[PDB]
Symmetry: D2
Subunit: 123 residues, 4 copies
């Protein structure tokens, strides 16, 4: 994978959450997420996908991943997906937007989903 | 997994796309996605997560998954994430919202990400 | 004068049973009231927005958006929704939207400030 | 009369270099112009929106939103953006927003009609 080495490792966002990911040659993302906010504690499984053969025109590398907020400690009956791109260079970044959906009744489904944006850096 | 059987299988959305997924007892989602629209053809790997122990109060089951739009045929330098919930009963549904991010230059990153919503049914 | 001024103007209903009453101006203005069937809302709220008053003539819809702040003379939910979408004319006219609802929060909770969803409005 | 009428009113700039000039009314109205540094845009466009004119007094921000349709006397991009966010006062005042930009599309292409993003506005 072109950016397999760039992506693999530990990332931190502006909330102080910690994302540890392995990128596979085949496009796979696997790892763990630890949120510094919300109904969450310790690590949660994450899985996702990335473009393992990106353009070489200066564009970023598209990726996404999911966390369902159940681990051996807690269950927040919810899942977040991050969609974004990896940008390399002196100062690498993963810029994302996310969707967090909670399980709701049918009557409350209109208010099921939060949206936001996280920027991840290596330091 | 509570809804392991409900989720596993073939789903279709309002665009005529086809999602085939296996839910694992541990929360895993694995399968393939085939879009009926956009810069896509044949199947793409998908991975994601679901709440394997949801509430039993009538609420839906939170889940999400990712597709990176590279397979052995095509590469659209982009990834979609779906965030949503599974709703069981007579007429089962997965109601989602999604984020599609394309790799862009830095100058064009403001226009990197589409948002939309897909509803999946079994028929 | 606005191409779809007459199409847009009027009363619309969404899948939740909410009611959207809007006047489109020749200049691109949208003005009206919204009444939500759900949430911390009662009676009508002011809305204002904008639409493309000179759209393409190629089968494309007509881009528009509007905002409601959820304060009126009855209640205040310390929040605002924006709908962004397009109007699609014809037999079965529709306004297809996605929306963002932001509540006022502390700094610490701002990650959790904004709901997203989608509403489809029809005339009947 | 609006609690943050004086805080909101004025000129704001985002991380792209766009310029947002807005007057907040006592009644919850927002009126002004937007000039984008990016995209199919040139010069100023009308904006209208709403804000919570009686917010909580507990550290929470002030919910607001506005719309711009991307048609003026120079150009038409057949599209509209809505910003949904909150104003946060103090030393380093900010309006933190997420936005939806919908273009007019055919029915067949409507799945690809809407961009989403986030803008942070400051006074300097
Ligand atoms: O809280 C959660 C799970 C944690 C989600 C953290 C997010 S992912 C996007 C962003 N990026 C990060 O690095 N961290 C945040 N779910 C839901 C959402 C929520 O508000 C909720 C919740 C419920 C209750 C009991 S009713 C209390 C609280 C406050 S702790 C949160 C959840 O139970
Ligand atoms: O097209 C794609 C990949 C397919 C995405 C299909 C989406 S997932 C959310 C929704 N739900 C579904 O079941 N299907 C749709 N990427 C990007 C997006 C796009 O517009 C773009 C594209 C580029 C070009 C050449 S510049 C042409 C076209 C028209 S085919 C699309 C892509 O290349
Ligand atoms: O509830 C509100 C205001 C109403 C918003 C209705 C939305 S506009 C997008 C969609 N489309 C429609 O036609 N109707 C819905 N704000 C916030 C949102 C919310 O969840 C919340 C809320 C607070 C409380 C007590 S703090 C209780 C409830 C349940 S009534 C909702 C708010 O107080
Ligand atoms: O470009 C426009 C209008 C300008 C929108 C600027 C956005 S509002 C959210 C963000 N925040 C800001 O302060 N500025 C940006 N519409 C659409 C969007 C787009 O990609 C598109 C476009 C079309 C064409 C030819 S068809 C070329 C280009 C590149 S100039 C963009 C449009 O024609």
């Amino acid at each position: 994978g072109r950016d397999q080495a760039g992506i693999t490792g530990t990332w931190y966002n502006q909330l102080g959450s910690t994302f540890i990911v392995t990128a596979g040659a085949d496009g796979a993302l696997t790892g763990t997420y630890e949120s510094a906010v919300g109904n969450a504690e310790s690590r949660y499984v994450l899985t996702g996908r990335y473009d393992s053969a990106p353009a070489t025109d200066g564009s970023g590398t598209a990726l996404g991943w999911t966390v369902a907020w159940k681990n051996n400690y807690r269950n927040a009956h919810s899942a977040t997906t991050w969609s974004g791109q990896y940008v390399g260079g002196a100062e690498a970044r993963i810029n994302t937007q996310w969707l967090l959906t909670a399980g709701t009744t049918e009557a409350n489904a209109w208010a099921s989903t939060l949206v936001g944006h996280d920027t991840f850096t290596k330091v």
